[PDB]
């Protein structure tokens, strides 16, 4: 039958708990010196801390270069007249001289770094070890974190101040920070998934500071690389798994990560028609082509349970004779392929909040998470199970979403919700 198929794809209370601890199981094993580098989640510390020290969550570095003429941003969050909060913002362009332009990348960098150098220092923001973000614009008429860590070393002096700084979640943290102070959790679910929290300072073995808090990279997309949740795969995802260009690699993105959430109800659909549950057992030369159902449709699905006519289309389009049934066959696909990613979300996210809980403890976590991705922007059942889920698995924590501003990315969306925040 039918019914019987899909349910493989639950994931009962238990199952999810599991999940969810397996889960800090493998965050600490990243954050774990003695095993941060052979472990699976990476875990990887950001620096985007703050500390006593002076350090705040807002502090950047944008570093803008392209042409003949490269200019770099400063921002640091402050207190004001008042203790209110604030955002300074800092520009400086720097110009490359017609020797070093027309030089090698060694050179060029050697000259920006020296840039940096003197920039840092008539700002009193020498050895602070902030944040670097990268841009690059295009002069029109009328690695370089590699080579810049380079020519930063090169120097002879004291390697600590910048401090990479190029992952998209971090800047939807951040990102978010600056409209809600209370962000402390960044998350990126759309084509691949990863999430970032604010870490203890005294948990992350590799910094040397203990006092205060860290943003971490988790990318936990890793997660399960190490069997972690060979249990609860399916013989689909393992097609799927099996069949990329990374095999046994990023598993449990492989889960959540819409890059492949078409590909699954794809394989789940194929399944059935072969079984003689679905199309009279006869599918399409289309249908049977990897890639060839695409996420878009999954949500142009769920967005309406009123009519089947985009399910139709869709199908129709695909080169098949949909039936009244067989349309409620392939809506319960998606529904149970999406909810099933999205419950696996909600495992880890909520491990990560949990996890944040037991840190600070006191009665009830009023914690905001930024989101951003298209998975959990363009599927409304996604988000609306995945919210639930995750608010029913953190007892006592007050859990606000809230999603990343219009149009930008990584230190792009950075240096502009901040420039704009400035202007006030
Ligand atoms: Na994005």
Redesign the pocket.
Known sequence: MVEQILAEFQLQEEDLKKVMRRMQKEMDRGLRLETHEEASVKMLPTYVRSTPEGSEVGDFLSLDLGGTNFRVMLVKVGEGEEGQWSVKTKHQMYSIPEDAMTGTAEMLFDYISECISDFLDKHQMKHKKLPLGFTFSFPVRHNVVGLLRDAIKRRGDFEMDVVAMVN?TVATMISCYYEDHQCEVGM?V?TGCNACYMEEMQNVELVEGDEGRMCVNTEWGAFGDSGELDEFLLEYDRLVDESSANPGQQLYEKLIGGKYMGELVRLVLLRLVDENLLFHGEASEQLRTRGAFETRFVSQVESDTGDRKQIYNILSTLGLRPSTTDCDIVRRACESVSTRAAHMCSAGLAGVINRMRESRSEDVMRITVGV??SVYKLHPSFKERFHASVRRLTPSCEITFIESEEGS?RGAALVSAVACKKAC
């Open positions: 998209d990126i759309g951003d991705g990315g």
